[PDB]
mmCIF file of N, CA and C and ligand atoms in Angstrom:
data_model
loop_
_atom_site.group_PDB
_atom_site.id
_atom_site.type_symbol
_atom_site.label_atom_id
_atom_site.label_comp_id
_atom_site.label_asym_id
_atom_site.label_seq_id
_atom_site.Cartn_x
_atom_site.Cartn_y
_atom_site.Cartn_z
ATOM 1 N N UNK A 1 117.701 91.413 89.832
ATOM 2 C CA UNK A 1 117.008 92.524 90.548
ATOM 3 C C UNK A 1 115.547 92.180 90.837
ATOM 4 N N UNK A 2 115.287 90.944 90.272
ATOM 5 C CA UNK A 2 113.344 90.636 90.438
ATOM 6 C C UNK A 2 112.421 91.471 89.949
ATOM 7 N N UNK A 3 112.893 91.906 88.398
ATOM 8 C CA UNK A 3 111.837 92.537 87.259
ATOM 9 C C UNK A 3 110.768 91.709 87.126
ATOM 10 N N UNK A 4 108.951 92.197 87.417
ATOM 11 C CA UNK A 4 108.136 91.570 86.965
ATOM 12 C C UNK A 4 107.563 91.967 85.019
ATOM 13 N N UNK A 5 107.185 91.476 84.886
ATOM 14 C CA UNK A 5 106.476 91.370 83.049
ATOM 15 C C UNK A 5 105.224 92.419 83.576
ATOM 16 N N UNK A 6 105.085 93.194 82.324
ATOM 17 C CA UNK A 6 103.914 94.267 82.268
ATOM 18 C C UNK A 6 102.484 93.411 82.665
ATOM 19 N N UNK A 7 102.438 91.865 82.338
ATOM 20 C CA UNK A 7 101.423 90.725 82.840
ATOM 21 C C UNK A 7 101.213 90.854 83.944
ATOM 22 N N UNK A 8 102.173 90.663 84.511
ATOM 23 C CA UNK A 8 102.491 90.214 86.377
ATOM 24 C C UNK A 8 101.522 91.568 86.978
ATOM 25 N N UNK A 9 102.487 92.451 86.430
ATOM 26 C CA UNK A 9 101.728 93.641 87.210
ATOM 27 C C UNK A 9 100.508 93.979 86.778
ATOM 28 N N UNK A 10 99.914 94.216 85.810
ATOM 29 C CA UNK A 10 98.421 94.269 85.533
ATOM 30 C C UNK A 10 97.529 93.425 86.649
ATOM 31 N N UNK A 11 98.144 92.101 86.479
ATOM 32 C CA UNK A 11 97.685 91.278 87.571
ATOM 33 C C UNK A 11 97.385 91.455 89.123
ATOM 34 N N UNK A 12 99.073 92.137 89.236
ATOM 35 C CA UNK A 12 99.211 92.290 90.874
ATOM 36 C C UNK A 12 98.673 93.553 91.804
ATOM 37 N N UNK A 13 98.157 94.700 90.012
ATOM 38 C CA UNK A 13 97.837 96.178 90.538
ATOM 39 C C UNK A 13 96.126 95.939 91.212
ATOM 40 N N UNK A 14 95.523 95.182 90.363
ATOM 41 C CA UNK A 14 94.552 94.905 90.500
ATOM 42 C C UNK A 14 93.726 95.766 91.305
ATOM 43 N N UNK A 15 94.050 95.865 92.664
ATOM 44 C CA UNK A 15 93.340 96.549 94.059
ATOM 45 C C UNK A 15 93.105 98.249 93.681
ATOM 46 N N UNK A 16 94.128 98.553 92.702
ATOM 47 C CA UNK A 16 94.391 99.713 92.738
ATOM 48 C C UNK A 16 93.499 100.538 91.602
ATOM 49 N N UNK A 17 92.984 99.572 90.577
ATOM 50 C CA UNK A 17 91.758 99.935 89.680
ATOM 51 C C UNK A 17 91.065 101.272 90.303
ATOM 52 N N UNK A 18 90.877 102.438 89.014
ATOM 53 C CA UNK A 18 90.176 103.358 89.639
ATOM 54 C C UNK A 18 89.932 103.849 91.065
ATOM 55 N N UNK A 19 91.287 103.892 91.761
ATOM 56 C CA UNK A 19 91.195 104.418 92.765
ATOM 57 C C UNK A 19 91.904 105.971 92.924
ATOM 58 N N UNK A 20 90.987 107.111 93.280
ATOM 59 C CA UNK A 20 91.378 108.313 93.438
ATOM 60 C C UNK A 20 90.988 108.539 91.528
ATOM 61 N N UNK A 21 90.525 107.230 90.879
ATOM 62 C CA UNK A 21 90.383 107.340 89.424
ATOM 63 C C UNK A 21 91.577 107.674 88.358
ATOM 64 N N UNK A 22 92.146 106.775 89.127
ATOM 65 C CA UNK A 22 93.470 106.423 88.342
ATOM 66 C C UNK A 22 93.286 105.147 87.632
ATOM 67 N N UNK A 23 92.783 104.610 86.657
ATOM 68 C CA UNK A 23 92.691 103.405 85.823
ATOM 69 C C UNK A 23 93.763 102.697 86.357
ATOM 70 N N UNK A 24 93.759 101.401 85.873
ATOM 71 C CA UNK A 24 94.374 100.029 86.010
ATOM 72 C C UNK A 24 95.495 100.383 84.988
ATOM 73 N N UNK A 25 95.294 100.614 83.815
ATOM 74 C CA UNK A 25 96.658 101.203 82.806
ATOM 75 C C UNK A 25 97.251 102.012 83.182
ATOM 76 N N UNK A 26 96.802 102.755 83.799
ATOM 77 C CA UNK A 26 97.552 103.973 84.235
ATOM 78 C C UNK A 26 98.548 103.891 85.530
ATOM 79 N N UNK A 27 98.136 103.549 86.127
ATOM 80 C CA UNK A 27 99.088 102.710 87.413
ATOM 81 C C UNK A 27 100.264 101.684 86.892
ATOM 82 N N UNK A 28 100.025 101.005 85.900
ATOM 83 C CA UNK A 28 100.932 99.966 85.332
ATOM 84 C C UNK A 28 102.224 100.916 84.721
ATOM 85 N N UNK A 29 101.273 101.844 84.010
ATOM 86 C CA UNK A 29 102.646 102.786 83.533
ATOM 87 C C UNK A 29 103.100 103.863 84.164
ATOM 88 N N UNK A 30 102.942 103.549 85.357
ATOM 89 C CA UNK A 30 103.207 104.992 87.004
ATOM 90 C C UNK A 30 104.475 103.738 86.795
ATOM 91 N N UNK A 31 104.114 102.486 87.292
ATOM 92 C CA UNK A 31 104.853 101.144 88.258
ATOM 93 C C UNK A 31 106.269 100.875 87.168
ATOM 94 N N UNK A 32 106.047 101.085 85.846
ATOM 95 C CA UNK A 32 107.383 101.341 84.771
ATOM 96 C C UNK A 32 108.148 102.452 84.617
ATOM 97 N N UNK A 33 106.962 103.378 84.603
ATOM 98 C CA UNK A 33 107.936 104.582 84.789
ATOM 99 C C UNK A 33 108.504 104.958 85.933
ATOM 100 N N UNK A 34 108.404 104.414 87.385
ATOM 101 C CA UNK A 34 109.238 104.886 88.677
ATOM 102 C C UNK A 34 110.288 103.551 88.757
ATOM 103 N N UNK A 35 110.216 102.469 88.014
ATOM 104 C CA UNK A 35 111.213 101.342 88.644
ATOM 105 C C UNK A 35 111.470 100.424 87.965
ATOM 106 N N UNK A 36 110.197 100.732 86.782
ATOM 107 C CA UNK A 36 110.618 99.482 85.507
ATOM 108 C C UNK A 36 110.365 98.306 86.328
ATOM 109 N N UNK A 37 109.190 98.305 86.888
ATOM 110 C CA UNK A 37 108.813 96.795 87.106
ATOM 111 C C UNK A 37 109.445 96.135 88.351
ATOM 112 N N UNK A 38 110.920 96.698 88.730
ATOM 113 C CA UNK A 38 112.155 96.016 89.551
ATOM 114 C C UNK A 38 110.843 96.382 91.072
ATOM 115 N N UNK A 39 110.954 95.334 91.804
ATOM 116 C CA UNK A 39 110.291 94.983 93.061
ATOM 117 C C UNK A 39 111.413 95.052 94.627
ATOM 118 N N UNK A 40 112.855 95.925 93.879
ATOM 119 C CA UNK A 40 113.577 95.497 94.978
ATOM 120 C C UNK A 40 114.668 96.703 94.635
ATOM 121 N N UNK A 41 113.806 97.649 93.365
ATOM 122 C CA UNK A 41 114.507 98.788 93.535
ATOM 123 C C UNK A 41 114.885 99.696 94.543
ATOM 124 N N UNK A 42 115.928 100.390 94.891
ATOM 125 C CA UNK A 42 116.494 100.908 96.138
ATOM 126 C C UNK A 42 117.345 102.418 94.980
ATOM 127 N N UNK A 43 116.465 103.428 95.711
ATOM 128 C CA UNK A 43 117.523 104.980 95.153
ATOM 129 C C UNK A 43 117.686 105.746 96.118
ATOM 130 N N UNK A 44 118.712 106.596 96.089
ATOM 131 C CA UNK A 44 119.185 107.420 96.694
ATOM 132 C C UNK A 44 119.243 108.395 96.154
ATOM 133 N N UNK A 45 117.894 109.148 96.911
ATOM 134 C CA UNK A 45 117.249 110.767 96.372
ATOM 135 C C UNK A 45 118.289 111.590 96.992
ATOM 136 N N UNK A 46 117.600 112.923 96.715
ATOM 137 C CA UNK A 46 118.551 114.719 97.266
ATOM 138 C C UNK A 46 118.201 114.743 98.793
ATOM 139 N N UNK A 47 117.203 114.119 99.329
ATOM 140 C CA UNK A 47 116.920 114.238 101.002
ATOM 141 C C UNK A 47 116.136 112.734 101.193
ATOM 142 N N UNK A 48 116.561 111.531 100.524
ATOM 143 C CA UNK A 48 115.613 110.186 101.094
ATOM 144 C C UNK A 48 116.123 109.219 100.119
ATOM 145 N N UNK A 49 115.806 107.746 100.456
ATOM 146 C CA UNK A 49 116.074 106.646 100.117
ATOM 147 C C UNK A 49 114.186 106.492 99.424
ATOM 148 N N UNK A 50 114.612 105.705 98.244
ATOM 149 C CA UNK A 50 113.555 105.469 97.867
ATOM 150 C C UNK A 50 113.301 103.806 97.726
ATOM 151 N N UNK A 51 112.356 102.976 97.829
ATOM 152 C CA UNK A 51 112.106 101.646 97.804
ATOM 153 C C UNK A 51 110.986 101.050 97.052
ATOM 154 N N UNK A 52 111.124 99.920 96.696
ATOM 155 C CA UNK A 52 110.427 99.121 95.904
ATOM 156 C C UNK A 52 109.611 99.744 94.472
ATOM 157 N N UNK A 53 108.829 98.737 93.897
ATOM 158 C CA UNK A 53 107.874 99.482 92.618
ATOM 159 C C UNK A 53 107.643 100.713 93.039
ATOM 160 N N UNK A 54 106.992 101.054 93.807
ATOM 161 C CA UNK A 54 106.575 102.403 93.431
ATOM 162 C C UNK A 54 106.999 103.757 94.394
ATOM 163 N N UNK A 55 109.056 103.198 94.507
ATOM 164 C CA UNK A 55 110.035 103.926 95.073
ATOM 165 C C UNK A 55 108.937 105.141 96.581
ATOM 166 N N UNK A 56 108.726 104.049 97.186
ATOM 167 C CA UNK A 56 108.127 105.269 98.701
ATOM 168 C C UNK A 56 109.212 105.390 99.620
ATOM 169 N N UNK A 57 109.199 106.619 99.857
ATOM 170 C CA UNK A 57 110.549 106.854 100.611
ATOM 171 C C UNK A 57 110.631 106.790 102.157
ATOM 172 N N UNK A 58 111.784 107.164 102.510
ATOM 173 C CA UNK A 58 111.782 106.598 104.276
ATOM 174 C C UNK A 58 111.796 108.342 104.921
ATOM 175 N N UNK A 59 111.736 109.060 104.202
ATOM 176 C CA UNK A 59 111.488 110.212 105.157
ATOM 177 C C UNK A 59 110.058 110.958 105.508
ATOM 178 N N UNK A 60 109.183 110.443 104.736
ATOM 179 C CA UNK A 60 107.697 110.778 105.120
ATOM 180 C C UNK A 60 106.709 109.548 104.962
ATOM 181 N N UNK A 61 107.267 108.500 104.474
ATOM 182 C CA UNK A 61 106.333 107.447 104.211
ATOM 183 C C UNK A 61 106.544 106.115 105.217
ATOM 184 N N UNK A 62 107.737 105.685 104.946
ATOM 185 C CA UNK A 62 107.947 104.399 105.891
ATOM 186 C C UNK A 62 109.264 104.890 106.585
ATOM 187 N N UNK A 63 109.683 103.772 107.491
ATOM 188 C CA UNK A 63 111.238 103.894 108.226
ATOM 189 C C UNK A 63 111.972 103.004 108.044
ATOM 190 N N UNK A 64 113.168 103.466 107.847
ATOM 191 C CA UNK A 64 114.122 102.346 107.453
ATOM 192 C C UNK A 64 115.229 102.668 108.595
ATOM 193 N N UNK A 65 116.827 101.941 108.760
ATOM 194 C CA UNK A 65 117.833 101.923 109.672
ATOM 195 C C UNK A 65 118.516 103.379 109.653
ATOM 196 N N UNK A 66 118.675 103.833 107.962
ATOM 197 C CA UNK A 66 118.826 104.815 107.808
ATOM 198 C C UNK A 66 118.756 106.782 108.398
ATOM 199 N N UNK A 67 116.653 106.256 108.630
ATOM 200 C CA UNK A 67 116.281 107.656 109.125
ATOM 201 C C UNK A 67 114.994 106.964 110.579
ATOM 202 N N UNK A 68 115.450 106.838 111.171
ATOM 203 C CA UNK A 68 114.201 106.439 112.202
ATOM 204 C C UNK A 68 113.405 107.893 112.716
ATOM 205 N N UNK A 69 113.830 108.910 112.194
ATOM 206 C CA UNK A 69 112.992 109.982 112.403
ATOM 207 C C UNK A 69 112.064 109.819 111.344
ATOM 208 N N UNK A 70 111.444 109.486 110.324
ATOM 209 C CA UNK A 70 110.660 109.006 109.461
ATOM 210 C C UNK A 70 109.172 109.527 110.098
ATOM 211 N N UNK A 71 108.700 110.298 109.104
ATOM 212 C CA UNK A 71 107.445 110.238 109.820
ATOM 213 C C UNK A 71 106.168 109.157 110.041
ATOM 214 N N UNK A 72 106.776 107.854 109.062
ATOM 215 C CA UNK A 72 106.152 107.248 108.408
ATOM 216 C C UNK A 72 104.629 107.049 109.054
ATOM 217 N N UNK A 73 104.114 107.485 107.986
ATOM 218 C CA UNK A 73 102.773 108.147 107.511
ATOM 219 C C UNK A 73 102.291 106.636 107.392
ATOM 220 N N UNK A 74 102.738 105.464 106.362
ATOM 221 C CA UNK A 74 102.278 104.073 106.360
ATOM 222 C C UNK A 74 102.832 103.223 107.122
ATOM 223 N N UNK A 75 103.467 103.594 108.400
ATOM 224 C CA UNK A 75 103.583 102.747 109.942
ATOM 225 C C UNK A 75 104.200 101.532 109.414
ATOM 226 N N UNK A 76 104.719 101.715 108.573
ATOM 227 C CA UNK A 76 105.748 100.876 108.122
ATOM 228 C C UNK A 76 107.029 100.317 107.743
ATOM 229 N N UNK A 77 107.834 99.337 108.028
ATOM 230 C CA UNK A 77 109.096 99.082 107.851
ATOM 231 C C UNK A 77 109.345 99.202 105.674
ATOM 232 N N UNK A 78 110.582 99.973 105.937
ATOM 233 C CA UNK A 78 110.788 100.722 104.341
ATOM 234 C C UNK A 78 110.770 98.484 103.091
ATOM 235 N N UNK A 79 111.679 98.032 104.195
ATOM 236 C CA UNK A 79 112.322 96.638 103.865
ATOM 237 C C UNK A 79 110.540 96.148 103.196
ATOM 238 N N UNK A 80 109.737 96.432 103.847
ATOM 239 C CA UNK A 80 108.919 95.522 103.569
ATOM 240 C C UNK A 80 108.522 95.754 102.048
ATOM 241 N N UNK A 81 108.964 96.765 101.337
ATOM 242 C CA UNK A 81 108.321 97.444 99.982
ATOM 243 C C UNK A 81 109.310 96.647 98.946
ATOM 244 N N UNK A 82 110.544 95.497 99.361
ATOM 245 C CA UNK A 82 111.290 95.174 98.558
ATOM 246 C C UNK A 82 110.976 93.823 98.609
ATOM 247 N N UNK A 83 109.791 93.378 98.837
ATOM 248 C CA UNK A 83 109.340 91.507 98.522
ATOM 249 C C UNK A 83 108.342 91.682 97.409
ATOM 250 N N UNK A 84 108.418 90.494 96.992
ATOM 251 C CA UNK A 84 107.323 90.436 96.014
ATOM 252 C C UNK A 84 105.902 90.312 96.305
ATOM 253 N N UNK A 85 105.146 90.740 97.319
ATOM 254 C CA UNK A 85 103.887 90.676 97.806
ATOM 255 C C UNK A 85 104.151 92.446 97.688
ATOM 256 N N UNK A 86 102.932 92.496 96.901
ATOM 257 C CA UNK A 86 102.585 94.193 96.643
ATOM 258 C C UNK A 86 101.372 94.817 97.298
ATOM 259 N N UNK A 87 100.983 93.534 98.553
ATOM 260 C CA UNK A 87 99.873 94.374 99.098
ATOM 261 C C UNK A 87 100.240 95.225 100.071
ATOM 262 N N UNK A 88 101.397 95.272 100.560
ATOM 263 C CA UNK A 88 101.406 96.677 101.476
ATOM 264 C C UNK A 88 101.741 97.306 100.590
ATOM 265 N N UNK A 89 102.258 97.796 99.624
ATOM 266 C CA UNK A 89 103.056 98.893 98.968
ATOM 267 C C UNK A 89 101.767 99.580 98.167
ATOM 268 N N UNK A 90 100.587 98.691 97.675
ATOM 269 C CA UNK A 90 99.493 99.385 97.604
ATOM 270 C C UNK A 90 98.918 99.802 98.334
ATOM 271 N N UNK A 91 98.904 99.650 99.197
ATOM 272 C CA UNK A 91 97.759 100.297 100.891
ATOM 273 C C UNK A 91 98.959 101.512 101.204
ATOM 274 N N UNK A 92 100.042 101.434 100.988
ATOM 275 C CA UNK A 92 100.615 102.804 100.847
ATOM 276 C C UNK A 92 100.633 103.669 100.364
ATOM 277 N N UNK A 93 100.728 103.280 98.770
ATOM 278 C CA UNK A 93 100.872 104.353 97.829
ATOM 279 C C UNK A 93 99.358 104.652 97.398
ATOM 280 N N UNK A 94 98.142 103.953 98.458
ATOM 281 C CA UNK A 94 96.983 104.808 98.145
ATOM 282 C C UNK A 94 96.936 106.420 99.290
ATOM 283 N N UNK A 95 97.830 105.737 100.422
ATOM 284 C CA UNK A 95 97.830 107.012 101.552
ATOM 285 C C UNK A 95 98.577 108.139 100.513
ATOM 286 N N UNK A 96 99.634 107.758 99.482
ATOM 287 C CA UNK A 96 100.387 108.885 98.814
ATOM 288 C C UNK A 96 99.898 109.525 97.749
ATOM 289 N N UNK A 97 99.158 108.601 97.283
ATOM 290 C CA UNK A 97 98.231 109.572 96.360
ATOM 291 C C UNK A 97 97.167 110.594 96.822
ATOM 292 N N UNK A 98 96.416 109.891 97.856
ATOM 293 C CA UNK A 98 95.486 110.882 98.786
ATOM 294 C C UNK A 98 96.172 112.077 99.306
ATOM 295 N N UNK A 99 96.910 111.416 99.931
ATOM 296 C CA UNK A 99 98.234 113.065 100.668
ATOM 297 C C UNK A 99 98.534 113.871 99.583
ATOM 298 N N UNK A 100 99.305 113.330 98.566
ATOM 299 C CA UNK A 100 99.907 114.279 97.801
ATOM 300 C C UNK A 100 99.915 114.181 96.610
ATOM 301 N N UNK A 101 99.159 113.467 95.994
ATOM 302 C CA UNK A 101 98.457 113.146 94.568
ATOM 303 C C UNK A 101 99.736 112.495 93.316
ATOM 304 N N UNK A 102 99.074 112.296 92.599
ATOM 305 C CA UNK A 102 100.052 111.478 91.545
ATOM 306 C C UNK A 102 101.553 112.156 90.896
ATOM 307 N N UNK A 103 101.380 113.313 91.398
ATOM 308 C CA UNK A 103 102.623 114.026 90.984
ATOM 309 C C UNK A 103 103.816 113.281 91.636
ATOM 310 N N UNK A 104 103.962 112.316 92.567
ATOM 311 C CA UNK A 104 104.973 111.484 93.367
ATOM 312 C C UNK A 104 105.768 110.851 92.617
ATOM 313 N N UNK A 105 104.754 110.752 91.451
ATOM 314 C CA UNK A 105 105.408 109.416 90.764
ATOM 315 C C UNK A 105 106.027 110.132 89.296
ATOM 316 N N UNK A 106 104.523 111.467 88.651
ATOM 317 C CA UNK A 106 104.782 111.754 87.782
ATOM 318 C C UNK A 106 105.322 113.491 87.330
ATOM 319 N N UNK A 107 106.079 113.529 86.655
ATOM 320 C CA UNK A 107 106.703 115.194 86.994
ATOM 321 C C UNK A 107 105.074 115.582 86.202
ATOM 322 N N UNK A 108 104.585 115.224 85.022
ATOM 323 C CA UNK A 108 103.641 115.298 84.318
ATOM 324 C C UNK A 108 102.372 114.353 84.017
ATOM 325 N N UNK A 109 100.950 114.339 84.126
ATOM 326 C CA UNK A 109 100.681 113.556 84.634
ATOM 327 C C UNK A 109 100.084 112.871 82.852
ATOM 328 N N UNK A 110 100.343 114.111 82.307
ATOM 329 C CA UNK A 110 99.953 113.310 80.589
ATOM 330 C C UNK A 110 101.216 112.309 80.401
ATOM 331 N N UNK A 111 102.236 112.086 80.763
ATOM 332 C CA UNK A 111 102.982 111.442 80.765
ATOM 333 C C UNK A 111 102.435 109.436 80.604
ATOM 334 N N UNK A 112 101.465 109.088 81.447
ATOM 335 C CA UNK A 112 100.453 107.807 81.495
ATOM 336 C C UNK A 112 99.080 108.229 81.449
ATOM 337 N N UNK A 113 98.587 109.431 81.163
ATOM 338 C CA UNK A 113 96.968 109.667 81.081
ATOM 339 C C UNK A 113 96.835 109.636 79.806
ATOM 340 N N UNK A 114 98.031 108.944 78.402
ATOM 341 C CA UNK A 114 97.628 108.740 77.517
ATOM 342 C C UNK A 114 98.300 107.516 76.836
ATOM 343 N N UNK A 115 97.246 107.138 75.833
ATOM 344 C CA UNK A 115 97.542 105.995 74.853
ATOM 345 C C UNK A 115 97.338 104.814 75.669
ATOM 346 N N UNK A 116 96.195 105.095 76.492
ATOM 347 C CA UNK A 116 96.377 103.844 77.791
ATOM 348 C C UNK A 116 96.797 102.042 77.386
ATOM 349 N N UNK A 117 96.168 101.504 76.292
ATOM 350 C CA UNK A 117 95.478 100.752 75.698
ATOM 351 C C UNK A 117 96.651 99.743 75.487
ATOM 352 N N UNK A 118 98.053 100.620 75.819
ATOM 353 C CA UNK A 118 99.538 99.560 75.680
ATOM 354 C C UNK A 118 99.615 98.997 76.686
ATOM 355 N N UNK A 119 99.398 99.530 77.547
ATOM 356 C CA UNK A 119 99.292 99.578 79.243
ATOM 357 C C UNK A 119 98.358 97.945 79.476
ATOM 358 N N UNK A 120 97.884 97.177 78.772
ATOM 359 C CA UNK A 120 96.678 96.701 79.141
ATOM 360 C C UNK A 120 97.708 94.636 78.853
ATOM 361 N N UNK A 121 97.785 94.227 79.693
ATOM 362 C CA UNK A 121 98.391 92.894 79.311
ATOM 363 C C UNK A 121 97.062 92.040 78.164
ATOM 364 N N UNK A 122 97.641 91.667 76.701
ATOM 365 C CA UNK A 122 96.765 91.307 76.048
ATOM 366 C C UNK A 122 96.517 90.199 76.276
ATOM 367 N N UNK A 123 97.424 88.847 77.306
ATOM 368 C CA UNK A 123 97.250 87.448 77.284
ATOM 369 C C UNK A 123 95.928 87.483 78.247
ATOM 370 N N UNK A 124 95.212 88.391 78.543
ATOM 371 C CA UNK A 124 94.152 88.302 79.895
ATOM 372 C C UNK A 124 93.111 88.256 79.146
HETATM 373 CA CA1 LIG B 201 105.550 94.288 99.862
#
């Protein structure tokens, strides 16, 4: 399925540091808790397909074959959220946090606003 290591991603979130002031730990454990790391995850929600780490869907975010009515909001093909280059999927999921804030990812947001400090790859 192309699971990255809690390393990889610390690494790869990088861009996303305190943005909207969401810490670097905190994003790492958004990116486990929506997909467990998998870079090529694919779900099938109650009204949308969801894609890659940080599952953005094809009915308000990107377009896929599926829904070409898509509003997609990040002018983007859904496919592209399932490679291992995470720089579009961050330039997205900053439009989704701005739009509609971290609740996307989290039903609760104490859920990763605590114990950050696991969150943190120690080989760095
Ligand atoms: Ca990508």
């Amino acid at each position: 399925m192309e699971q990255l290591t809690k390393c990889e991603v610390f690494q790869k979130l990088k861009d996303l540091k305190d943005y909207g002031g969401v810490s670097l730990p905190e994003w790492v454990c958004v990116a486990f808790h929506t997909s467990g790391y998998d870079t090529q995850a694919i779900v099938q929600n109650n009204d949308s397909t969801e894609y890659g780490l940080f599952q953005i869907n094809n009915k308000i975010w990107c377009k896929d074959d599926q829904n070409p009515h898509s509003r997609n909001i990040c002018n983007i093909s859904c496919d592209k959220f399932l490679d291992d280059d995470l720089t579009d999927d961050i330039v997205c999921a900053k439009k989704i946090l701005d739009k509609v804030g971290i609740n996307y990812w989290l039903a609760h947001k104490a859920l990763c606003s605590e114990k950050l400090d696991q969150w943190l790859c120690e080989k760095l």
